[PDB]
Every structure is written in structure tokens, then in C-alpha cells.
Design a protein around this ligand. Structure first.
Ligand SMILES: Cc1ncc(COP(=O)(O)O)c(/C=N/OCCC(=O)O)c1O
Ligand SMILES: Cc1ncc(COP(=O)(O)O)c(/C=N/OCCC(=O)O)c1O
Lengths: 276, 275
């Protein structure tokens, strides 16, 4: 498919869109972004995503270069020009300078629209492996562009789907995901003081309330995994994706569990409520 | 006026652009070095290009050019600039992370700017650092991620630079190696915890020649009351006295004799490492 980039008021072919090297997103990694996905060409949790983008910008001392309503209009228009199920990434850059006022005042912005690349049906059927590392994301409420550790943390990884941030053996979150453990039919997930306040996570907590599943907002430990029945990771593209192995440790029987499959079926049935 | 070498041409900096497909933009996958000139000659060029390769290799990035071609481009840009120059070669991840867990289509570019040395008055009176409870991830790699060097200054008094003090252990500055001076010894974080700076390496060599003991450990924020001096190093700032860290005044609160001594020896001895 011909992916798009919105930049300087125009929807360009992605492959032609360029950014000035003066921009401190290139020189110094000053940028924030979100990933927004479509179900039936409708963006899922667009407002909650645009609010998290602004909070990422504000937390990084970046003055918003457009209103949330303008970002929303561009996202909607580009989904329509794609004509397909879309992964949408709005990026807010630092721009050319950090002022004497300790603010990035000349921020740039662009929005990448790509055809959605959902996990293959077979990864929902068999589930995935995660590679644990002794590291965490600094300022976890802020989605910056720095995903260097999502990559370098692989390579001694054994074909793992994603890395899992396990600082001092405390499971916090995946490189692109909320992590859920299931122990004696309870959901266990890191509190928002340690993990990004995921849109999927918030929808999962609501489905747990509707289903009468207790949720403990604490960090599961790597040393608890032998006693777990199931595990899964969440995000707007991956939905609920079973996790059957973490490092060398198989999760219960090593195929997706009943409560993971149940919650994924409820998530898909219920999703219309959070589409815009 | 500033130049960027990109795609085989020296462009004015303000005209150079990079495709947004490049993972330096989307995912922070990039490494760089800062090289400075004394007398129109690059300082520690080969050691800098070796550290750039080491940063690339550590980030699973395949070099898009030989060190000899990078050296030739750096020299040519210095000649066009016609002033003392700060040179920054950038290695990007490019468009893809392959099946092979490697960035194989890396781009590169080289920014040439007039050197912006700290004003004489900052060496005379020395500077303040703002300590924060955090450090740089993968510290031996010089990645493009400096986001914490900016966000940390919001509540900073007008301190010159932030200082990474995770759990009260002093590691390094946002743009500098940190040195503490206690009972006439140099104390600086080991290279498992701080960038292997070219200025750091030159200072350790001057310390060996001067018979000054070096302890390669993290100094603690507690210990600053008993310290005599402190200073930060980098290829542009050279040796810059540090007279205050947060609420703690250092020794006499004015630049110390061993800091001024090492700065004079650094400037006298620099000719050895010019290329
Ligand atoms: C560090 C981190 N944690 C958690 C999440 C999950 O947050 P939501 O998606 O639930 O809002 C993300 C999102 N990545 O976005 C990638 C989406 C995906 O690829 O599945 C993330 O980057
Ligand atoms: C985070 C950090 N630590 C330490 C260093 C010190 O390394 P060298 O420079 O001695 O190789 C630097 C380099 N910037 O150098 C910037 C030039 C300056 O402003 O001093 C750096 O960015």
C-alpha cells in the first residue's frame, strides 16, 4: 500500500516526506508520538490518545504546535485517504531550539499513516515469548521517540516477540505493551506510577469490572511466573496477545489460557464503545 | 554559517533534510560524536571515529561508510568552514531493522558549525550544576537521546548543566565527564557507568604524567562537603570549573588550583592529539 505522511499541510507519499536536520528530534532525540489504530476505518480511543500526546509534549517542555482538534481532523482525513485499516502515528518534534525560557517553542509535527500490521492469527493461537531485561522506561507516563532499548535489548533474545522491562525482577511493562499476569483467576498488572497508562489497559480494567475479575494494580515478579496460569500483553494494534513464555519460563501449560481468550473475545465484541 | 554533509554534497545546514522513514526520527536509532578543532586541525579525530563505530556496533548499526571516508569528509568540511569548527557526524539506523537483528541501510550526515566556546567569565567564576535522580541508559553508547538534558533544567535555578546523580551517586553531566577533587585525588565515574570521553581520556593521561591518583568510582553527593574542587570536561568546553552542585558550594566556591593547573596543561599538551 502507498503509506502517507502529513507534514507542512500536505499528505505526501511516506517515502518522499523529509524533516530538517536542524530539528532536535534528529540531533538530541527530542520528540513524542502516539500509535492510534482503526477498527472498521474508525480510530480507537483517538481523544484519549491525543490527550496522552499533549501530556507527553507538556512533560518534555514542548509547546504544542497544533490544537488537539486540528490533529484529530488530520488523523480522520488521512484514514479516509488511506481507504484501509490504518496505524496512525502523530509525532511532535522539539524543532530547532530550546529557548532561554526552558521551552521548545518552534516544535514541528507530522503524522504517518500506514496499513495496519496486526499480529498474525497464529500468534493469537500459540501466543508469544518475551525476553526479560533488568531495565525500565524513565518518565513512564511520557511516550517519547527513544525506543533504542526496544532494539538493542533484543539480538541476545532467542526470537522473542518483545522485550519485557523487569527492573530488579519486578515486571513493569513491554517495550510496546501493558503486561498482565493471571494467578488464581486474578489479573495482576503494574500500577500507572510505573507503566504507561495504556488505552487498552484502561479498556481491560473496565472488562474485568463487567466480568467480576479482581485486578491487583501491583508489579508481578519474574519469581511468581511458575505459579501463574496465563499472561498477556496489550496495545491498540496487538489487542490482547497471549504470552506463553518469559525467558526460559513457560507460563502454565504454554498455550493461551481461557481468561486471556475470553477477555480478547469480549474486547473485540465491545470495542465499538471506544471508537470515534 | 553552518554546513551539513549529506548524500555526497556539502549543503547549507538549513537546507539538509532526512527522510521520516529513518528510524532516527521514528524510534531514536542514531549515534553521533562531537569533534572540535584547535588551529583548524581536528582534535582526536581517529579516537572519535573509533568511538562512533563502537556506538554504531553497540546499537546493531552497520557502518554506512568507512572511517577513512568519514575522516576525508570531516577534513574537507573543516577546510570550507574557514574558522574553528564543531563537527558532528551522525549515523542513523535507516529505514529497517532486518531479520538479522541489524540496521543494514544506515544513513550518515556531518554538521559543521562555528565552535561556541564558554565565555571567559565562566572559567574565571566557575559554574553550577543541577543534580537529578536519573542516569543515561546504555552509557558507553553515544546515542542521539539527550531528552533528559532538556526536561531536567525546567526547575534548575539557571544552573549551567544538569548532573546525573542516580540514588545520590554522581555519574556524569548531560554534555560532560564529571571530575571531583578530594585530598588532591581525581575522582570520576568508571566507563561501565559514564561515556568514555576523549577529554576524560586526555585528562587521565595528564593525571598519570602528573602523578595525580585517579579513583575510577562514582563520587556521592554526600562527600561534596569534604571535596576541594570539581570540574566537567568535553572537547568544546575543555576543563570547566564547577563551584556549586545544587545546595552544596564546592570548597572555596571559586575555581581550584588543580582544575586551573589541568586546564593550562590540557591546552599546552593538546598539539599531541591534533590530526
Ligand atoms: C511503552 C508502552 N507501553 C504500553 C503501550 C500500550 O499502550 P496502548 O496501545 O494500550 O495505548 C505502548 C504503546 N505502544 O503502541 C504500540 C501499539 C501496538 O503496536 O500494539 C507502549 O509504547
Ligand atoms: C553525555 C556526555 N558525556 C560526556 C561527554 C564528554 O565526551 P568528550 O567530548 O570529552 O568526548 C559528552 C560529549 N559531548 O561533548 C560536547 C562538547 C562540549 O560541550 O564539551 C557527552 O555528550
Amino acid at each position: 500500500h502507498m503509506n502517507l505522511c502529513y507534514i507542512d499541510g500536505k499528505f505526501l507519499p511516506l517515502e518522499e516526506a523529509k524533516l530538517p536536520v536542524t530539528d532536535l528530534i534528529i540531533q538530541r532525540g527530542v520528540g513524542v508520538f502516539e500509535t492510534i489504530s482503526t477498527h472498521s476505518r474508525r480510530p480507537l480511543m483517538l481523544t484519549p490518545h491525543l490527550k496522552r500526546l499533549e501530556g507527553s509534549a507538556t512533560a518534555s517542555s514542548i509547546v504544542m504546535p497544533a490544537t488537539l482538534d486540528e490533529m484529530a481532523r488530520i488523523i480522520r482525513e488521512g484514514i479516509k485517504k488511506m481507504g484501509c485499516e490504518t496505524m496512525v502515528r502523530p509525532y511532535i518534534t522539539g524543532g530547532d531550539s530550546f529557548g532561554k525560557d526552558h521551552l521548545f517553542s518552534s516544535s514541528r509535527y507530522f503524522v504517518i499513516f500506514a496499513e495496519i500490521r496486526k499480529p498474525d492469527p497464529i500468534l493469537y493461537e500459540k501466543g508469544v515469548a518475551l525476553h526479560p531485561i533488568n531495565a525500565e522506561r524513565y518518565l513512564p507516563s511520557t511516550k517519547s521517540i527513544n525506543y533504542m532499548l526496544s532494539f538493542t535489548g533484543q539480538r541476545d533474545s532467542k526470537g522473542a516477540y518483545e522485550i519485557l522491562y523487569c527492573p530488579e525482577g519486578e515486571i513493569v511493562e513491554g517495550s510496546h505493551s501493558t503486561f498482565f499476569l493471571i494467578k488464581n483467576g486474578h489479573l495482576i498488572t503494574a500500577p500507572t506510577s510505573r507503566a504507561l497508562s495504556g488505552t487498552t489497559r484502561q479498556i481491560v480494567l473496565e472488562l474485568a469490572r463487567r466480568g467480576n475479575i479482581q485486578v491487583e494494580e501491583r508489579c508481578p515478579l519474574l519469581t511468581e511466573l511458575p505459579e501463574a496460569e496465563e499472561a498477556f500483553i496489550t496495545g491498540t494494534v496487538k489487542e490482547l496477545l497471549p504470552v506463553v513464555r518469559i525467558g526460559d519460563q513457560i507460563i502454565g501449560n504454554g498455550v493461551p489460557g481461557k481468561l486471556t481468550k475470553h477477555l480478547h473475545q469480549v474486547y473485540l465484541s465491545s470495542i465499538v464503545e471506544w471508537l470515534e
